[PDB]
Amino acid sequence: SVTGRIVAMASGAGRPVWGPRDTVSLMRTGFAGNPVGFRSVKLIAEATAAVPLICPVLDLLRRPNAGQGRAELFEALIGQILLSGNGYLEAVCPEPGVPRELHVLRSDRMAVVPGADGWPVGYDYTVGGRKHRFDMTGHPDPICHIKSFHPTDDHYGLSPMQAAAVALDVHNAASAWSKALLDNAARPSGAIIYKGADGQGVLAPEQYERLIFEMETHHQGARNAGRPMLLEGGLDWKPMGFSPSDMEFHETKAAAAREIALAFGVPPMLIGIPGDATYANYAEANRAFYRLTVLPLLTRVSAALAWWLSGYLGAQIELKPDLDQVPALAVERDQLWARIGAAGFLSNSEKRVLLGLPPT
Amino acid sequence: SVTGRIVAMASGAGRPVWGPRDTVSLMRTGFAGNPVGFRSVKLIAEATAAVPLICPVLDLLRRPNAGQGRAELFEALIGQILLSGNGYLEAVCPEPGVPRELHVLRSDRMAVVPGADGWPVGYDYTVGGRKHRFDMTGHPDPICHIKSFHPTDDHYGLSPMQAAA
Amino acid sequence: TIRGVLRSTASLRQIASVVNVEATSFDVLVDKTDMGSGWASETAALSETATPQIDRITIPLHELAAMPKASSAFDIETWLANRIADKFARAEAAAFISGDGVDKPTGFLTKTKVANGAWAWGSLGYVATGAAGDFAAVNASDAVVDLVYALGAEYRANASFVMNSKTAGAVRKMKDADGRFLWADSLAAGEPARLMGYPVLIAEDMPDIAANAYAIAFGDFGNGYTIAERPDLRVLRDPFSAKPHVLFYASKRVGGDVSDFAAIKLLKFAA
Amino acid sequence: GGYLVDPQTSETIRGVLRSTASLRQIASVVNVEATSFDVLVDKTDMGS
């Protein structure tokens, strides 16, 4: 408010503020690059789309636009929040109330404008060199801007991939270590050293094709494994080894594959990375997933759709996750129905009102 | 459909398309060669024959031909699908309805013909240098061609042995 | 945050007619003369009084290009994009005022000026001040006021002055015989921004006061000067050519000359 | 008045029409990805 008016004129009013430089490069190296960063976002964005909502307005959410369904919208929406900390939703309003179009604008090509009083007046969709300049100097405010929490910045989110940006580059390069080691490596299974009478001496190409053909036919392969291999004077066979055989950055990749899953908040058991057994039997780790990183994330976006879309309506609407018939929370529902169902002292209608039932 | 008509004339209409080269050599080295590849097909092909079916027509399936029983048919049928991704069943119809012969044609010696509109018109059983040219330009279509899923090819299956080669 | 020198921003863009054009050029169509209708006689032939000869003036819609090589404290992509947009906003300002014909918009100063009172269509009109060095010594600002009142009452509905900073300096240096600052009287006033009831545009690409220079312009540039342009800015985020330097490619295309030769009047500091 | 009026152009940039028969129609093409292709023919037959 009053502090915001002072903050604007420091950065510059009326001019675009970009924020993160590398957020276009963390997507290609951290979401199209490694499977752990890929699966972690896909595990969350496909979970928030599956959660039903509680309110008309949801008829817009069920069918926002052509080729982009209800579940496909939140996968695009949360998939921008997990990737770049910012969610955007353009609304096209031919009609005054409940605009019949929603569009997830990607957050690579969007930039904020601080405006006069510190709270934003412009958003700039910049593809190529071409802009749009959406306007926020009105009441319906055609873009909801969902921020992840950022303590240092005043206009953007923190994007958990930015917090895991070291552990992505460890996991990307340790996995590419073993790829290029299997592709650039010369191990021999031995070496036939031929010194000669001198300290140095080549063998003639007559003798050399004799040496290949007795090696090609009689010594290499599975079927020639272990021939006794007569060595006359001058010749000698030094068998080479391969001293680091397995495990090239095997644990530092597996520790970095856990820190990527740590930052987005998925448990190691759901994604499939190896590791020590923290959660027990998937009734917990799936319940932990829909309680520490999905439903807090989904109740934060739905609280912004409940306020941005109510600016198009007259009456304000609440919009919250269901927190009921979501089958990962069944262990919190067994535990609460068997507690009150076994409490026989209080009567029948006195516990339908506790469990959420329509009373009789 | 419409895309298929264009696809045909690229490969060549009226001419046989063979597909996999090595499928005759993966059988000797992967099904007669190692016990793990041998038992894996025998474990599945003897399981699909044991499963009953729900429908007359099953009277054909119970006794397809001489020396080749109901359970022996699906062992031959699935044993070609697991080995070479393709299943074939010739039907001999002296009678118009429910033809009283079924024969698992091996998929080493069978080749497809794309035909005009991309969907097949000919199948060619080639043993030695001798052909047969089964015809698909009719309604009963005397060979069922069971494909395993192949994303890159338009006429054959993927044959899990090729993936484990 | 990386800083830069803060350059002048006022650019004649906000007072001239900005037309979004998509083709290669923009053709404005102005008639050069009048209908020439006369009062008819009661017994006369009365035929073919006259017809205005029209003229197409072509806005060539040139292009502007600047090509810097890029060669984590501050982020270059946003900063260089905030510098090259400023340079494209400032380098077209010089072309709008004193640009020549070759590959760039021809500014309104380069249009073969003719002294007002002998004004024809193909030129711009000026009024002389007096002595060649500066304003007239006996009566200053008489050149300013008859520059205003030698234009035409239809264009003076929304007309503006165009100067640079140190010509508005020499205007505010004008004083009466007691030295009381004809424009913005006290030392506590500031820029009054309403010279002769009309706005002032401080455009630094105007020349300063010299022996013959046209340092003060006045006009309805909405009819006078037509800026035809394409609104976008090309952004080639180039990852090739040089591995060492990104060498971003940014271009905006823009054109413009005068559409109406009657709107703009100049002040020649000569006799 | 001659500057006032401007001509109407065609809807498509059109070209001189040249033939399409190319012997690609009658020869046999192969969908191949390589740097070379090696046909395998039999110059002579076995003695019988």
Side-chain angles (χ1 to χ4, degrees), chain C residues 219-246:
Chain C
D220 176 72
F221 288 94
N223 296 317
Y225 195 81
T226 296
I227 296 168
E229 68 182 2
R230 193 182 297 273
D232 58 357
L233 182 59
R234 297 289 90 187
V235 279
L236 274 304
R237 277 76 177 263
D238 164 58
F240 301 114
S241 304
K243 305 306 71 181
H245 324 273
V246 170

PDB file of all heavy atoms in Angstrom, chain C residues 219-246:
ATOM      1  N   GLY C 219       3.487  23.701 -34.988  1.00  0.00           N
ATOM      2  CA  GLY C 219       2.469  23.121 -35.835  1.00  0.00           C
ATOM      3  C   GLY C 219       1.534  22.085 -35.259  1.00  0.00           C
ATOM      4  O   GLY C 219       1.798  21.489 -34.211  1.00  0.00           O
ATOM      5  N   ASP C 220       0.406  21.902 -35.939  1.00  0.00           N
ATOM      6  CA  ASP C 220      -0.445  20.732 -35.761  1.00  0.00           C
ATOM      7  C   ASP C 220       0.197  19.579 -36.510  1.00  0.00           C
ATOM      8  O   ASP C 220      -0.065  19.356 -37.693  1.00  0.00           O
ATOM      9  CB  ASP C 220      -1.858  21.004 -36.261  1.00  0.00           C
ATOM     10  CG  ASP C 220      -2.754  19.780 -36.175  1.00  0.00           C
ATOM     11  OD1 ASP C 220      -3.156  19.366 -35.079  1.00  0.00           O
ATOM     12  OD2 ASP C 220      -3.067  19.215 -37.228  1.00  0.00           O
ATOM     13  N   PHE C 221       1.047  18.838 -35.826  1.00  0.00           N
ATOM     14  CA  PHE C 221       1.718  17.737 -36.491  1.00  0.00           C
ATOM     15  C   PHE C 221       0.816  16.536 -36.707  1.00  0.00           C
ATOM     16  O   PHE C 221       1.203  15.643 -37.461  1.00  0.00           O
ATOM     17  CB  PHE C 221       2.958  17.343 -35.703  1.00  0.00           C
ATOM     18  CG  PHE C 221       4.058  18.344 -35.795  1.00  0.00           C
ATOM     19  CD1 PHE C 221       4.195  19.321 -34.837  1.00  0.00           C
ATOM     20  CD2 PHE C 221       4.931  18.338 -36.860  1.00  0.00           C
ATOM     21  CE1 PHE C 221       5.201  20.255 -34.925  1.00  0.00           C
ATOM     22  CE2 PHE C 221       5.942  19.265 -36.945  1.00  0.00           C
ATOM     23  CZ  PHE C 221       6.071  20.229 -35.980  1.00  0.00           C
ATOM     24  N   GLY C 222      -0.376  16.514 -36.104  1.00  0.00           N
ATOM     25  CA  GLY C 222      -1.330  15.455 -36.399  1.00  0.00           C
ATOM     26  C   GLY C 222      -1.805  15.484 -37.840  1.00  0.00           C
ATOM     27  O   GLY C 222      -2.074  14.439 -38.435  1.00  0.00           O
ATOM     28  N   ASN C 223      -1.906  16.673 -38.422  1.00  0.00           N
ATOM     29  CA  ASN C 223      -2.117  16.771 -39.856  1.00  0.00           C
ATOM     30  C   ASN C 223      -0.808  16.912 -40.605  1.00  0.00           C
ATOM     31  O   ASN C 223      -0.686  16.396 -41.720  1.00  0.00           O
ATOM     32  CB  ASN C 223      -3.015  17.959 -40.189  1.00  0.00           C
ATOM     33  CG  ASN C 223      -4.401  17.811 -39.614  1.00  0.00           C
ATOM     34  OD1 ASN C 223      -4.999  16.736 -39.669  1.00  0.00           O
ATOM     35  ND2 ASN C 223      -4.911  18.885 -39.028  1.00  0.00           N
ATOM     36  N   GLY C 224       0.177  17.574 -40.007  1.00  0.00           N
ATOM     37  CA  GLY C 224       1.428  17.829 -40.686  1.00  0.00           C
ATOM     38  C   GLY C 224       2.283  16.611 -40.942  1.00  0.00           C
ATOM     39  O   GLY C 224       2.486  16.228 -42.095  1.00  0.00           O
ATOM     40  N   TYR C 225       2.782  15.982 -39.889  1.00  0.00           N
ATOM     41  CA  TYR C 225       3.781  14.937 -40.023  1.00  0.00           C
ATOM     42  C   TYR C 225       3.119  13.590 -39.767  1.00  0.00           C
ATOM     43  O   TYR C 225       2.497  13.392 -38.722  1.00  0.00           O
ATOM     44  CB  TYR C 225       4.929  15.170 -39.047  1.00  0.00           C
ATOM     45  CG  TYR C 225       6.135  14.344 -39.366  1.00  0.00           C
ATOM     46  CD1 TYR C 225       7.017  14.742 -40.355  1.00  0.00           C
ATOM     47  CD2 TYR C 225       6.376  13.150 -38.713  1.00  0.00           C
ATOM     48  CE1 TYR C 225       8.117  13.994 -40.661  1.00  0.00           C
ATOM     49  CE2 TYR C 225       7.472  12.386 -39.026  1.00  0.00           C
ATOM     50  CZ  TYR C 225       8.336  12.814 -40.003  1.00  0.00           C
ATOM     51  OH  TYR C 225       9.436  12.061 -40.320  1.00  0.00           O
ATOM     52  N   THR C 226       3.244  12.668 -40.716  1.00  0.00           N
ATOM     53  CA  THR C 226       2.656  11.338 -40.588  1.00  0.00           C
ATOM     54  C   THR C 226       3.753  10.317 -40.345  1.00  0.00           C
ATOM     55  O   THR C 226       4.604  10.099 -41.210  1.00  0.00           O
ATOM     56  CB  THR C 226       1.862  10.956 -41.832  1.00  0.00           C
ATOM     57  OG1 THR C 226       0.755  11.848 -41.989  1.00  0.00           O
ATOM     58  CG2 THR C 226       1.344   9.546 -41.701  1.00  0.00           C
ATOM     59  N   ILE C 227       3.732   9.697 -39.173  1.00  0.00           N
ATOM     60  CA  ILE C 227       4.591   8.571 -38.852  1.00  0.00           C
ATOM     61  C   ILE C 227       3.813   7.310 -39.166  1.00  0.00           C
ATOM     62  O   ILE C 227       2.847   6.986 -38.470  1.00  0.00           O
ATOM     63  CB  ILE C 227       5.007   8.586 -37.376  1.00  0.00           C
ATOM     64  CG1 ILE C 227       5.841   9.819 -37.069  1.00  0.00           C
ATOM     65  CG2 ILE C 227       5.775   7.336 -37.023  1.00  0.00           C
ATOM     66  CD1 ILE C 227       6.024  10.042 -35.604  1.00  0.00           C
ATOM     67  N   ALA C 228       4.211   6.599 -40.210  1.00  0.00           N
ATOM     68  CA  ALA C 228       3.629   5.306 -40.534  1.00  0.00           C
ATOM     69  C   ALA C 228       4.610   4.232 -40.112  1.00  0.00           C
ATOM     70  O   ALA C 228       5.799   4.321 -40.427  1.00  0.00           O
ATOM     71  CB  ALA C 228       3.318   5.184 -42.024  1.00  0.00           C
ATOM     72  N   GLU C 229       4.121   3.235 -39.385  1.00  0.00           N
ATOM     73  CA  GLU C 229       5.030   2.267 -38.795  1.00  0.00           C
ATOM     74  C   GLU C 229       4.306   0.953 -38.570  1.00  0.00           C
ATOM     75  O   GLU C 229       3.095   0.837 -38.762  1.00  0.00           O
ATOM     76  CB  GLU C 229       5.590   2.768 -37.474  1.00  0.00           C
ATOM     77  CG  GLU C 229       4.529   2.832 -36.426  1.00  0.00           C
ATOM     78  CD  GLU C 229       5.034   3.363 -35.121  1.00  0.00           C
ATOM     79  OE1 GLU C 229       6.224   3.727 -35.039  1.00  0.00           O
ATOM     80  OE2 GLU C 229       4.237   3.409 -34.164  1.00  0.00           O
ATOM     81  N   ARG C 230       5.082  -0.033 -38.150  1.00  0.00           N
ATOM     82  CA  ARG C 230       4.608  -1.313 -37.683  1.00  0.00           C
ATOM     83  C   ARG C 230       4.914  -1.411 -36.200  1.00  0.00           C
ATOM     84  O   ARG C 230       6.051  -1.129 -35.800  1.00  0.00           O
ATOM     85  CB  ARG C 230       5.299  -2.439 -38.446  1.00  0.00           C
ATOM     86  CG  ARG C 230       4.683  -3.806 -38.263  1.00  0.00           C
ATOM     87  CD  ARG C 230       5.478  -4.848 -39.026  1.00  0.00           C
ATOM     88  NE  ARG C 230       5.461  -4.599 -40.460  1.00  0.00           N
ATOM     89  CZ  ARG C 230       4.516  -5.041 -41.276  1.00  0.00           C
ATOM     90  NH1 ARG C 230       3.518  -5.769 -40.801  1.00  0.00           N
ATOM     91  NH2 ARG C 230       4.576  -4.760 -42.567  1.00  0.00           N
ATOM     92  N   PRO C 231       3.946  -1.778 -35.358  1.00  0.00           N
ATOM     93  CA  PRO C 231       4.115  -1.577 -33.909  1.00  0.00           C
ATOM     94  C   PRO C 231       5.105  -2.523 -33.255  1.00  0.00           C
ATOM     95  O   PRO C 231       5.642  -2.188 -32.192  1.00  0.00           O
ATOM     96  CB  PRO C 231       2.704  -1.812 -33.358  1.00  0.00           C
ATOM     97  CG  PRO C 231       1.798  -1.690 -34.535  1.00  0.00           C
ATOM     98  CD  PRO C 231       2.583  -2.211 -35.686  1.00  0.00           C
ATOM     99  N   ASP C 232       5.367  -3.682 -33.847  1.00  0.00           N
ATOM    100  CA  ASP C 232       6.143  -4.704 -33.172  1.00  0.00           C
ATOM    101  C   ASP C 232       7.634  -4.373 -33.200  1.00  0.00           C
ATOM    102  O   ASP C 232       8.080  -3.396 -33.805  1.00  0.00           O
ATOM    103  CB  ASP C 232       5.866  -6.084 -33.784  1.00  0.00           C
ATOM    104  CG  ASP C 232       6.172  -6.162 -35.285  1.00  0.00           C
ATOM    105  OD1 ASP C 232       6.552  -5.149 -35.902  1.00  0.00           O
ATOM    106  OD2 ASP C 232       6.020  -7.258 -35.862  1.00  0.00           O
ATOM    107  N   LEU C 233       8.403  -5.210 -32.520  1.00  0.00           N
ATOM    108  CA  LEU C 233       9.852  -5.133 -32.529  1.00  0.00           C
ATOM    109  C   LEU C 233      10.387  -6.544 -32.691  1.00  0.00           C
ATOM    110  O   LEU C 233      10.059  -7.424 -31.888  1.00  0.00           O
ATOM    111  CB  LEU C 233      10.365  -4.493 -31.240  1.00  0.00           C
ATOM    112  CG  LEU C 233      11.865  -4.293 -31.130  1.00  0.00           C
ATOM    113  CD1 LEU C 233      12.318  -3.429 -32.260  1.00  0.00           C
ATOM    114  CD2 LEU C 233      12.198  -3.646 -29.805  1.00  0.00           C
ATOM    115  N   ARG C 234      11.184  -6.768 -33.737  1.00  0.00           N
ATOM    116  CA  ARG C 234      11.714  -8.096 -34.009  1.00  0.00           C
ATOM    117  C   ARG C 234      12.736  -8.479 -32.949  1.00  0.00           C
ATOM    118  O   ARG C 234      13.530  -7.646 -32.506  1.00  0.00           O
ATOM    119  CB  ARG C 234      12.357  -8.138 -35.391  1.00  0.00           C
ATOM    120  CG  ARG C 234      11.417  -7.887 -36.562  1.00  0.00           C
ATOM    121  CD  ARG C 234      10.447  -9.030 -36.835  1.00  0.00           C
ATOM    122  NE  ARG C 234       9.192  -8.904 -36.099  1.00  0.00           N
ATOM    123  CZ  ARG C 234       8.245  -9.838 -36.063  1.00  0.00           C
ATOM    124  NH1 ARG C 234       8.395 -10.968 -36.741  1.00  0.00           N
ATOM    125  NH2 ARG C 234       7.139  -9.633 -35.360  1.00  0.00           N
ATOM    126  N   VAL C 235      12.697  -9.730 -32.523  1.00  0.00           N
ATOM    127  CA  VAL C 235      13.579 -10.236 -31.478  1.00  0.00           C
ATOM    128  C   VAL C 235      14.152 -11.564 -31.966  1.00  0.00           C
ATOM    129  O   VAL C 235      13.568 -12.637 -31.792  1.00  0.00           O
ATOM    130  CB  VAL C 235      12.862 -10.364 -30.129  1.00  0.00           C
ATOM    131  CG1 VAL C 235      12.817  -9.019 -29.453  1.00  0.00           C
ATOM    132  CG2 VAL C 235      11.405 -10.816 -30.314  1.00  0.00           C
ATOM    133  N   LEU C 236      15.325 -11.510 -32.594  1.00  0.00           N
ATOM    134  CA  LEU C 236      16.042 -12.719 -32.986  1.00  0.00           C
ATOM    135  C   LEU C 236      17.052 -12.974 -31.877  1.00  0.00           C
ATOM    136  O   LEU C 236      18.111 -12.336 -31.808  1.00  0.00           O
ATOM    137  CB  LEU C 236      16.710 -12.588 -34.349  1.00  0.00           C
ATOM    138  CG  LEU C 236      15.900 -12.897 -35.613  1.00  0.00           C
ATOM    139  CD1 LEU C 236      15.326 -14.301 -35.539  1.00  0.00           C
ATOM    140  CD2 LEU C 236      14.806 -11.871 -35.910  1.00  0.00           C
ATOM    141  N   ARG C 237      16.679 -13.887 -30.978  1.00  0.00           N
ATOM    142  CA  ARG C 237      17.539 -14.389 -29.907  1.00  0.00           C
ATOM    143  C   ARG C 237      18.477 -15.434 -30.506  1.00  0.00           C
ATOM    144  O   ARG C 237      18.296 -16.641 -30.343  1.00  0.00           O
ATOM    145  CB  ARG C 237      16.703 -14.982 -28.777  1.00  0.00           C
ATOM    146  CG  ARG C 237      16.130 -13.997 -27.746  1.00  0.00           C
ATOM    147  CD  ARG C 237      14.926 -13.220 -28.267  1.00  0.00           C
ATOM    148  NE  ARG C 237      14.347 -12.341 -27.259  1.00  0.00           N
ATOM    149  CZ  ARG C 237      13.303 -12.651 -26.502  1.00  0.00           C
ATOM    150  NH1 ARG C 237      12.687 -13.817 -26.655  1.00  0.00           N
ATOM    151  NH2 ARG C 237      12.857 -11.783 -25.607  1.00  0.00           N
ATOM    152  N   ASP C 238      19.489 -14.937 -31.211  1.00  0.00           N
ATOM    153  CA  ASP C 238      20.315 -15.759 -32.092  1.00  0.00           C
ATOM    154  C   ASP C 238      21.317 -16.600 -31.309  1.00  0.00           C
ATOM    155  O   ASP C 238      22.116 -16.041 -30.556  1.00  0.00           O
ATOM    156  CB  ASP C 238      21.024 -14.854 -33.086  1.00  0.00           C
ATOM    157  CG  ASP C 238      22.173 -15.527 -33.771  1.00  0.00           C
ATOM    158  OD1 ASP C 238      21.980 -16.573 -34.419  1.00  0.00           O
ATOM    159  OD2 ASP C 238      23.282 -14.961 -33.700  1.00  0.00           O
ATOM    160  N   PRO C 239      21.271 -17.966 -31.408  1.00  0.00           N
ATOM    161  CA  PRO C 239      22.208 -18.947 -30.749  1.00  0.00           C
ATOM    162  C   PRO C 239      23.212 -19.509 -31.762  1.00  0.00           C
ATOM    163  O   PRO C 239      23.642 -20.632 -31.579  1.00  0.00           O
ATOM    164  CB  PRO C 239      21.220 -20.046 -30.352  1.00  0.00           C
ATOM    165  CG  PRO C 239      20.261 -20.108 -31.525  1.00  0.00           C
ATOM    166  CD  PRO C 239      20.252 -18.721 -32.140  1.00  0.00           C
ATOM    167  N   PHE C 240      23.549 -18.716 -32.785  1.00  0.00           N
ATOM    168  CA  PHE C 240      24.439 -19.171 -33.886  1.00  0.00           C
ATOM    169  C   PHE C 240      25.372 -18.031 -34.307  1.00  0.00           C
ATOM    170  O   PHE C 240      25.450 -17.031 -33.564  1.00  0.00           O
ATOM    171  CB  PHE C 240      23.610 -19.612 -35.095  1.00  0.00           C
ATOM    172  CG  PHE C 240      22.640 -20.735 -34.829  1.00  0.00           C
ATOM    173  CD1 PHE C 240      21.272 -20.523 -34.905  1.00  0.00           C
ATOM    174  CD2 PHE C 240      23.093 -22.005 -34.513  1.00  0.00           C
ATOM    175  CE1 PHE C 240      20.380 -21.556 -34.664  1.00  0.00           C
ATOM    176  CE2 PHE C 240      22.200 -23.037 -34.271  1.00  0.00           C
ATOM    177  CZ  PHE C 240      20.845 -22.810 -34.347  1.00  0.00           C
ATOM    178  N   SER C 241      26.057 -18.186 -35.445  1.00  0.00           N
ATOM    179  CA  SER C 241      26.969 -17.138 -35.984  1.00  0.00           C
ATOM    180  C   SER C 241      28.233 -17.019 -35.129  1.00  0.00           C
ATOM    181  O   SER C 241      29.325 -17.294 -35.661  1.00  0.00           O
ATOM    182  CB  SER C 241      26.264 -15.812 -36.131  1.00  0.00           C
ATOM    183  OG  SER C 241      25.109 -15.937 -36.947  1.00  0.00           O
ATOM    184  N   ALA C 242      28.093 -16.637 -33.854  1.00  0.00           N
ATOM    185  CA  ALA C 242      29.264 -16.591 -32.948  1.00  0.00           C
ATOM    186  C   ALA C 242      28.917 -17.302 -31.638  1.00  0.00           C
ATOM    187  O   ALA C 242      27.938 -16.886 -30.987  1.00  0.00           O
ATOM    188  CB  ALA C 242      29.672 -15.159 -32.706  1.00  0.00           C
ATOM    189  N   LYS C 243      29.685 -18.330 -31.263  1.00  0.00           N
ATOM    190  CA  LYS C 243      29.456 -18.990 -29.950  1.00  0.00           C
ATOM    191  C   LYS C 243      29.767 -17.979 -28.842  1.00  0.00           C
ATOM    192  O   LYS C 243      28.960 -17.871 -27.897  1.00  0.00           O
ATOM    193  CB  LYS C 243      30.341 -20.233 -29.832  1.00  0.00           C
ATOM    194  CG  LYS C 243      30.193 -21.242 -30.964  1.00  0.00           C
ATOM    195  CD  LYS C 243      28.763 -21.687 -31.195  1.00  0.00           C
ATOM    196  CE  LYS C 243      27.891 -20.610 -31.806  1.00  0.00           C
ATOM    197  NZ  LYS C 243      26.494 -21.071 -31.987  1.00  0.00           N
ATOM    198  N   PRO C 244      30.898 -17.209 -28.925  1.00  0.00           N
ATOM    199  CA  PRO C 244      31.369 -16.184 -27.913  1.00  0.00           C
ATOM    200  C   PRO C 244      30.341 -15.072 -27.655  1.00  0.00           C
ATOM    201  O   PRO C 244      30.098 -14.768 -26.502  1.00  0.00           O
ATOM    202  CB  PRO C 244      32.644 -15.591 -28.527  1.00  0.00           C
ATOM    203  CG  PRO C 244      32.520 -15.903 -30.000  1.00  0.00           C
ATOM    204  CD  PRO C 244      31.852 -17.260 -30.037  1.00  0.00           C
ATOM    205  N   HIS C 245      29.772 -14.497 -28.719  1.00  0.00           N
ATOM    206  CA  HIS C 245      28.815 -13.368 -28.559  1.00  0.00           C
ATOM    207  C   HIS C 245      27.446 -13.761 -29.123  1.00  0.00           C
ATOM    208  O   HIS C 245      27.399 -14.209 -30.284  1.00  0.00           O
ATOM    209  CB  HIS C 245      29.357 -12.115 -29.256  1.00  0.00           C
ATOM    210  CG  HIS C 245      30.837 -11.965 -29.155  1.00  0.00           C
ATOM    211  ND1 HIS C 245      31.446 -11.331 -28.092  1.00  0.00           N
ATOM    212  CD2 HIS C 245      31.831 -12.363 -29.979  1.00  0.00           C
ATOM    213  CE1 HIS C 245      32.751 -11.344 -28.262  1.00  0.00           C
ATOM    214  NE2 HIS C 245      33.014 -11.972 -29.414  1.00  0.00           N
ATOM    215  N   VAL C 246      26.377 -13.557 -28.349  1.00  0.00           N
ATOM    216  CA  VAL C 246      25.006 -13.950 -28.797  1.00  0.00           C
ATOM    217  C   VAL C 246      24.657 -13.153 -30.058  1.00  0.00           C
ATOM    218  O   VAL C 246      24.107 -13.761 -30.996  1.00  0.00           O
ATOM    219  CB  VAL C 246      23.967 -13.702 -27.688  1.00  0.00           C
ATOM    220  CG1 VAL C 246      22.546 -13.852 -28.207  1.00  0.00           C
ATOM    221  CG2 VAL C 246      24.200 -14.604 -26.487  1.00  0.00           C
TER     222      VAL C 246
END
